Amino acid sequence: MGDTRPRFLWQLKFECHFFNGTERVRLLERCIYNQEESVRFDSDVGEYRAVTELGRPDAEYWNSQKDLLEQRRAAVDTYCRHNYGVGESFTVQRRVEPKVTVYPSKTQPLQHHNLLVCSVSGFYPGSIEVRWFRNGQEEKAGVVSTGLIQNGDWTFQTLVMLETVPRSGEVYTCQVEHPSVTSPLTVEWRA
Amino acid sequence: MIKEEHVIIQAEFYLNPDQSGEFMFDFDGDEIFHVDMAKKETVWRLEEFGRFASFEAQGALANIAVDKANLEIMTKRSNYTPITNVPPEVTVLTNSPVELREPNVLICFIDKFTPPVVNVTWLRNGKPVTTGVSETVFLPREDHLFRKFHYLPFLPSTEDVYDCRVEHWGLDEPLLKHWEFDAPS
C-alpha cells in the first residue's frame, strides 16, 4: 500500500425496510463512526436513540429539534414509500431468466470426473429451485449447492453438484424453476 | 418463494484525511446508482434504470459536505481514535461456466473490509492487464464493512493463469487470488 496515516470514517445509512410489498414499512437511519454505530432513528421507536455513549449527545441534540423529528417521523411516507414507488418496476419486479448448463467436474486435482455440476446463471431475482434426475428418477443424496452468488450486476448464479461417476446409457437431467418461467427449464446430459 | 422483505439503503460515507466521499443506493445488495463525486453525476448501475428514474446529483454532494462536517466533530469527540484496519477476503470466479475460447468475465469479489480504500490489479501470467476492466463503487454490509467487485473480460485458454492482486492497509502483503481454467470444484 503506502501512507499509513490514521483514518477516520463516518457512514450514514437510511434503510427503508418493506414487508409484503409496502404493507409494513420501517425507516432506520444509522450513523456509524469507524465501524461503530453510535446513534440511530428507528421509525418504530419515533425518536433518536444512542447506540453507544459516543452517540448520546447527538440523540439528545436531534431529539430536541421538534421540526427535524416530525420530518423523520413522516419519512416512511415521503421518502421510503416514495422511493419504493419510483424503483419498483425495475427492482422488486425485475425478472431475468436463468441460463442453465451441465458439465462434469472433479472434487480433486488429477482424479477423474466424479461430479456433475448444474450451473444456473444470469438470473434475477434470487428465488430458484434446482433438482437432479438420473434416467428420470430424482437424485436426492450427494447433492450439494453453493447457494446463491450475487455477481454485483443484478444477476445471480448458483452451482448445484451431483456426486456421480456417469456410465453410458445414463441420461442426467437438471431441472430449474424460477419466477421468470411458468414451466421448469430442463437441460439433459449424458457421458 | 415470493420474497417477503426488501430493503433500500441510501448509504454514504466520508473518509479523512483522504477526503473521499461516496453516495449510493443499494436494493437487496445490488447497487441502484451512485453519484460520481469528481464528475458530479448520477451513474445508474444499469444504463436502463435512468430511463425510468432520475436523481439530482447536487443533493448528494450537499450530504457528503454535512457528512464531512460531522466526521470532523466525531473525530475530536472521540479524541482522534482511528479506524482499525480490517483486511478483505477475496474470491475470484467467472460470471458464467468456463468454456475454452468463449468470451467470459472474471469477477474479483472483495469483501468484509474497511476503511474503503483498496488497490486491485488483474494479473495475467504475472503481468498487469487493464483492457476492458471495470469496477463498482464500495457497497454496504450490515456489519458496516464494505463490498466491492472488479471485473475482467477474458477469453478462457488452457495456457493462461490469472491472479487478482488486492492490496489494503490491513494486509501484511498483497493478497493474490488465483484462477485458471479446469480448476477442481
Partner: peptide, 17 residues
C-alpha cells in the same frame, strides 16, 4: 416521464464550543 428518487438529508451535529 422519469420519477425523481428522493434523498434524505443528514442532520448537523452541534458545534463543539
Amino acid at each position: 416521464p422519469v420519477s425523481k428518487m428522493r434523498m434524505a438529508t443528514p442532520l448537523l451535529m452541534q458545534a463543539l464550543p
